[PDB]
Amino acid sequence: EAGEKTVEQFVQALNKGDYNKAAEMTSKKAANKSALSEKEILDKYQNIYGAADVKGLQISNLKVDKKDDSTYSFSYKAKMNTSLGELKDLSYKGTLDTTINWQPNLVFPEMEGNDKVSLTTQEAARGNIIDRNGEPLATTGKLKQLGVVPSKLGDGGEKTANIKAIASSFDLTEDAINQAISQSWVQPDYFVPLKIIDELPAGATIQEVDGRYYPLGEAAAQLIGYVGDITAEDIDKNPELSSNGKIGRSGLEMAFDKDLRGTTGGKLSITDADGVEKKVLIEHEVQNGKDIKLTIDAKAQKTAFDSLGGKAGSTVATTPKTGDLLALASSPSYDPNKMTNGISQEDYKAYEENPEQPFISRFATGYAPGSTFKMITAAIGLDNGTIDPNEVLTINGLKWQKDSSWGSYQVTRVSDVSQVDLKTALIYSDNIYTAQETLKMGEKKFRTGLDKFIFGEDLDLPISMNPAQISNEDSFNSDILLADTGYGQGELLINPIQQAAMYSVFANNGTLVYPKLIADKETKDKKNVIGETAVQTIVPDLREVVQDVNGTAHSLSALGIPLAAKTGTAEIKGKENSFLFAFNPDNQGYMMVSMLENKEDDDSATKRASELLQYLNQNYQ
């Protein structure tokens, strides 16, 4: 009858922690109907379940018959979550009076009379994400935790005045302080945690508590990611997750959650009235999460993020001969510490509504590579024999088009240099030279040179990422699209990591070295991507891009360090992105690609790259 509804509500009240209503659905105390009073059932359920942090109690196979004229029996299978994992396949049985004749059979299947529960949980320590030199990127730190002692809080209006004072001095609703103070585990003299603080009234104290901590903060927020309290929804996906631990929601905290979380150790069992083991429900051994060391340099990461100055952009720093990802900075960013602990709705809405989008991992976002890609188009042209470094094109003005069939579109350069060869085009960042040489090269030869790269490949990196593409379809279907792809801004989509991968060929004499994030990983490369002669022709021109007084990266020559560089721009609609590629041509110890997305006028990726270049030249030979 309607007794099935009485069982559904009973499991629903137990599922969300409401033990008083669940106990209110029980029958009066007797020997035929119910074994305890409602308060006794309340205390038993709290003491047992809440100690085990029982959440996500879900039932199935619910069958309800009718035993006598006023009794109806019921049975169902149940699944539970504890600090020790999932309790699946649990057979519950009992009677109905519609009320519930409660027996200790309904706490755990095979308890009877005055049986107790043994919960010994003592373990867990999430693995640490450390940099290439052992510096912490995601460890456990001592955080400041403000909470309230109910006894030292006051009586009557004193308590209300102090609650309003604490709620006003730290921005929290009065109802939160009163709800945490009135929760069922709290005692008058216990420390009730309220918030973690990034003038303490009567009752407010602050403790030092272990918690997930990110030393670099926003500087590595996109890469490392952040952690969050496990919900019932997450327990639905993976059963072995403890119902109280933390789970990585983004970045490497999520990509490596199984390797970093370990397994909480303990034993949940049922004992008799005299404490002798009856049934072992759950038991596992303590296993802390495994630490994960990356190729990231802590100081290089911090410097590459600070150099972006909060503007929209990204910076990737590698050791091109091995592929070690020294730095993966994305700006703007968010506070991961304030994200894992206590984040207000207003601040999270400010994060999500920011047009610059601090949440996106810009180092893994496909972009038009800009006129930097000129290098690639040059190398291909030097491999197939299309581009003679000696030949000089006569270019008049700042705009050019193949013919009047382009209508209103023209390729734009910045410097009106009449005689332009390859070295001059690299020094002045000439887009017209590149467009003309690309059109003379043809689509077939250009795509032949391009397919020697990593277009369409899915890199072996623990970062969510889409493979780089040359264009939308397999053919350009347009001379304009071919020319624009020539100087790196058509339907091209290459994220900064893939950009560094492709550009590594100039530091390995034509061999592409795939980027590496895990330090233990072996070095994988791809040989004969571009010819050796193309490298030995372009790299000195890339030196001239810095040394010549009209090189677009001449401001770096003041640093007095061996640099081979190439600037770039990309117009999308108008919005303009700035690019800088730079590496040590003497020892190939480091390589760097930086980007300013939708740059402010007078701003450039080269204007902010000096300090990172100095650090990399000092510490990576």
Tab-separated table of C-alpha atoms in Angstrom, residues 217-226 250-251 305 330 332-340 351 358-361:
chain	number	residue	atom	x	y	z
A	217	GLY	CA	48.982	30.430	-6.277
A	218	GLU	CA	47.521	31.970	-9.418
A	219	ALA	CA	50.942	31.696	-11.081
A	220	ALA	CA	50.243	27.985	-11.578
A	221	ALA	CA	46.473	27.819	-11.076
A	222	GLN	CA	45.584	26.617	-14.581
A	223	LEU	CA	48.350	23.998	-14.705
A	224	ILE	CA	48.160	22.519	-11.199
A	225	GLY	CA	44.427	23.047	-10.749
A	226	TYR	CA	42.510	22.828	-7.484
A	250	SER	CA	40.750	20.731	-12.894
A	251	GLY	CA	44.359	20.659	-14.025
A	305	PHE	CA	53.424	34.486	-14.923
A	330	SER	CA	48.480	31.399	-18.358
A	332	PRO	CA	44.852	36.104	-16.133
A	333	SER	CA	44.424	33.484	-13.407
A	334	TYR	CA	42.482	32.659	-10.248
A	335	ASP	CA	43.393	31.987	-6.626
A	336	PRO	CA	43.487	28.188	-6.176
A	337	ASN	CA	43.888	28.431	-2.393
A	338	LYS	CA	40.756	30.555	-2.039
A	339	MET	CA	39.166	28.133	-4.519
A	340	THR	CA	39.705	24.901	-2.534
A	351	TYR	CA	35.906	34.801	-12.048
A	358	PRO	CA	41.039	33.466	-16.052
A	359	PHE	CA	39.810	29.851	-15.946
A	360	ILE	CA	40.969	28.868	-19.444
A	361	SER	CA	44.368	27.175	-19.700
